[PDB]
Amino acid sequence: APDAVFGDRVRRFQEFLDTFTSYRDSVRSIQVYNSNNAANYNLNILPHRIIISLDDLREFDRSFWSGILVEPAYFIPPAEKALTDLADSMDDVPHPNSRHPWKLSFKGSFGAHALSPRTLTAQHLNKLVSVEGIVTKTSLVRPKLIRSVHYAAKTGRFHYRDYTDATTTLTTRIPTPAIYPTEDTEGNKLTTEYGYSTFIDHQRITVQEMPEMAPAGQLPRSIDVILDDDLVDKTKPGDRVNVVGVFKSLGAGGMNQSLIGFKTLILGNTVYPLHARSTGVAARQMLTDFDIRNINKLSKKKDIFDILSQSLAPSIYGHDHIKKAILLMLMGGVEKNLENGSHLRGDINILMVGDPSTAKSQLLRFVLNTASLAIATTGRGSSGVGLTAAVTRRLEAGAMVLADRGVVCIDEFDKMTDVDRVAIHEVMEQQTVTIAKAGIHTTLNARCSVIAAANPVFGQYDVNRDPHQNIALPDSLLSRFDLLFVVTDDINEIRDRSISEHVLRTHRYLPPGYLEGEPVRERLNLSLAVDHVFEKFNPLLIPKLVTIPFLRKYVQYAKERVIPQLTQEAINVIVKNYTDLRNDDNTKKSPITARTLETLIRLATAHAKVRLSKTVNKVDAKVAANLLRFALLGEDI
């Protein structure tokens, strides 16, 4: 039976949708997208879901906003009905072959409802809450029968029955346990018609307080979240997540005479995978047309490589070719997948062996902070079980499996066991992890670029000795590292005063919105995995330095929209340089193998990607070989 208050709220939300035109634009775009590939194929179908900004709702109608936040069961169904009515009103051109219920998702500032699994108590029940946590368990995506269609052969007629549970609606119904129809009303045997029955995907994930904010030494708190038909498979275990949903109570909690307390869970409305450092979530960024224009504008510059090289770690003094190599690894080459099935690696590995305090770990931490997807590990702090996969009858991804299509920053690389070393041997060239353990023969993808830091045998790189004795690493392992940089802390007066002036200038830095003696606050930077190009603060005083967010945008653009093709004019340089490096006797820091030809190719491709060029020209090969010759010998030609 119709409710006057329900209709009043429906028309109020219709007024809200009319006021903010972005929601008709979103619904219209979704409908035209669905119709266009429906007619095209007689890709994927976008869900009937709209992101609603709670700030705009508060601006429009504060009580509707407070009603949704505090009494969602009475305000969300009317708003969803209004959205569905609006969508069916604009649906003048129906999809080929009210109706099509549209769901709502919420975003914005939740205030006191933005909680965690620890702070989510029983006085938040029946409220729209945003819970931030870590996904620890993801159940199987199971179909749920919401409508069963049967066939009666004697009458030749198709019947159906709709099913309802306590979690499909925000309000409580009268429970109607309608049985599965095994026969008609008048005795005819029914045959279930699979493919005409309706099954809805259902998942139940567990969100636990994030380790970065959970109290140390205390047992963590968890909360159940239920996802239905479009939020399933939106996250994976170990993901940082922000789930917006209604904190519901279900069952009777032992009152109904046939539990210790009422069964509580979150009916998920929105799932946002969050980006935290050293996690398995990549960093999607929004690239406006202005950002792309600036990226192309800077790519037109000749010295853009240098501009990108110095802007990586201005705080670190020097380490300029190391920064060039780090930028090239951030871009990386393009992997080759030949038709027969073979794989050519397109990821660049870097090793930095050096004396104490030459900033190898700060250069690792910077890469961890700025990379799209980076996992930080330490030698012997993570084993092969912790680096590669692990069998739990089920597999748990390790450091280098979560970092697939990403970067692995390994500090204290020398303090790594040989059992880990063999797994690392497999991961670096073939980019795969073969388990073959306890009846689980699986080949996980570990297409990751490894950057590592190491110390010499005696703790100080002796220039009198040779590198092979100063490294104490297997030669086969050192071959996998595309670029091996030996950094030595030479005491020279010019660079001594220059590095000290830099260190002090960096220490004498103030944020734009801070006082002289105000302790700088620090948050954990839980970015959402979806305004000037250059940097005001320049530790060096000189070319221009771009901001780290803009550098990340540039790296993302070049990494996702540029796939350079090798050219003969680059091949001549690459082949000549490889032949010289193989045959010339120079007492190289690292050996020269066919892997050296491919690090030449990969670095040339990466530098071509830096310039946004779709073809690797001669200059790219020359600069790649230049960096390689520096890395092998120390030349400055």
């Binding site: 380790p211 047992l219 700060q362 002289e516």
Partner: protein
């Protein structure tokens, strides 16, 4: 006592002490629920304002329609119009100190509700006022019942602190007292003399302790390049030189502090220990001194005797103040913004004046680079000092002279550990000084001078010095200068702070480098 609860205490208010060993997850209990009949639409409400503390549920839904046939239990709960409260199950236990040698320690189930939930954590020593009550569920028995406690109040004692158990809120007069104490021109001496007044003859070490407790100012560069502000101090010395006692005092006086060994405590870890959950088998941070003491200091005794699994972890958590856990399924960078005060013994029992500080120590030489200031506490066998130390130590032992003279000296020349701890908290939470440009230039000149002299000493020799002056050492002198400036709540570190930090760096890691045959002239 928990073992003295007979059957005469049943359904009565009892006060009993113990330790919490378990805190269950909060469960929702209906305090007001709307109900509606199934084969009707009869709306009713059941209010639960009392009897919320019981293992069972004394009040259930009606077995009849209450509108007077509909059937048995025809009511369903309208969950969007009902009200719920929190409940928690705690597990009290008699303290393990006062337990019979050969018997199980006795535990007792407790239930709390509403505002008595999430008040204590496991391991907290508490005083529980409650109702000693009964529920039916301690195995084979007739007419026996399971006792428990309905908690009416929890009185936690002074327990372990954390970065979550921090006030950060000063009463108005307390800020004024600290601020008056801050202009005190002899603040450096009053705070130095308050560092273990009982330990004798370690003024430079006490100044280093003061600087470590203050620490430098942190920087968050636009690159995300974090520069560390905490200070790490190492004390290599002869046995019996007070190194541990100054670690224990630093543990006592710091707001948040953890005192451990190289191998850890009896069962407590030392770094981030990710472990499977006791019931849900889900990865969680079991503990570790470096994550438990986040935001404060850790006093690592016997730093030389430490495993390699803890080696790399502490090496990471001193420069980047972050422990990078990466296991099969869990990967996280845990904040470990902790100052490290380490005490170590020479490989031979006494410090060998002949040999360098390196090769006279068990651990790696380059670990000496990670520490900001290294104090070689040699023992001098001169009798003047022996007699003075013996007289001081006797004054400690039933002489009662040091206690009285410290209470007398507290009036204008010493500060109590509570007041000094709160002052440390205020200084860390309110001040973060910078360097004046002239101070920075003179720091650079000083560092260049030290490094050039090290180069001169190393050029003529063959091997390298055990204690090297690296860029980390420059960044440390900066931290000491900023700590000295923050001592007096100075927003800017002037020349005098730089000079004092320079003197401290000559006292330690430069006098420590003096014994180096290559680091010396």
């Amino acid at each position: 006592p928990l073992r003295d609860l007979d059957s005469e205490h049943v359904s009565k208010i009892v006060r009993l002490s113990g330790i919490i060993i378990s805190t269950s997850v909060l469960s929702s209990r209906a305090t007001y629920l709307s109900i509606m009949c199934r084969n009707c639409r009869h709306t009713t409400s059941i209010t639960i304002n009392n009897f919320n503390s019981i293992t069972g549920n004394t009040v259930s839904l009606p077995r009849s329609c209450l509108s007077t046939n509909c059937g048995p239990d025809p009511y369903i709960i309208i969950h969007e119009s009902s009200k719920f409260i929190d409940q928690q199950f705690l597990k009290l236990q008699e303290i393990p100190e006062l337990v019979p040698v050969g018997e199980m320690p006795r535990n007792l189930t407790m239930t709390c509700d509403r505002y008595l939930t999430n008040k204590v954590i496991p391991g907290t020593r508490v005083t529980i006022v409650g109702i000693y009550s009964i529920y039916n569920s301690g195995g084979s028995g007739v007419a026996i019942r399971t006792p428990y406690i309905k908690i009416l109040g929890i009185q936690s004692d002074v327990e372990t602190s954390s970065i979550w158990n921090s006030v950060t809120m000063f009463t108005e007069e307390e800020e004024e007292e600290f601020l008056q104490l801050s202009r005190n021109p002899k603040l450096y001496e009053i705070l130095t003399n308050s560092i273990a007044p009982s330990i004798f003859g370690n003024e430079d070490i006490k100044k280093a302790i003061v600087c470590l407790l203050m620490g430098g100012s942190k920087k968050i560069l636009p690159d995300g390049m974090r520069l560390r502000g905490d200070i790490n101090v190492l004390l290599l010395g002869d046995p019996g030189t007070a190194k541990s006692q100054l670690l224990k005092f630093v543990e006592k006086v710091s707001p948040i502090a953890v005192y451990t060994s190289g191998k850890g405590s009896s069962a407590a870890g030392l770094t981030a220990s990710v472990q499977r959950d006791p019931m849900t088998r889900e990865f969680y941070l079991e503990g570790g001194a470096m994550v438990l003491a986040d935001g404060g200091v850790v006093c690592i005794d016997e730093f030389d005797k430490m495993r390699d699994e803890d080696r790399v972890a502490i090496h990471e958590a001193m420069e980047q103040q972050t422990i990078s856990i990466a296991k099969a399924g869990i990967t996280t960078v845990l904040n470990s913004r902790t100052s490290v005060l380490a005490a170590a013994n020479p490989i031979y029992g006494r410090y060998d004046d002949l040999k360098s500080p390196g090769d006279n120590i068990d651990f790696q030489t380059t670990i000496l680079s990670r520490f900001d200031m290294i104090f070689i506490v040699k023992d001098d066998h001169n009798e003047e000092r022996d007699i003075s130390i013996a007289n001081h130590v006797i004054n400690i032992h039933t002489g009662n002279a040091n206690a009285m003279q410290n209470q007398q000296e507290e009036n204008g020349s010493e500060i109590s550990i509570e007041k000094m701890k709160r002052y440390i908290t205020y200084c860390r939470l309110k001040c973060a000084p910078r360097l004046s440009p002239q101070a920075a230039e003179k720091l650079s000149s000083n560092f260049v001078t030290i490094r050039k002299q090290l180069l001169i000493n190393e050029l003529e020799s063959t091997e390298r010095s055990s204690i090297p002056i690296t860029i980390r050492q420059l960044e440390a002198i900066i931290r000491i200068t900023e700590s000295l400036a923050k001592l007096e709540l100075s927003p800017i570190a002037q020349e005098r702070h730089v000079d004092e930090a320079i003197r401290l760096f000559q006292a330690s890691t430069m006098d420590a480098a003096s014994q180096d045959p290559i680091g010396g002239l």
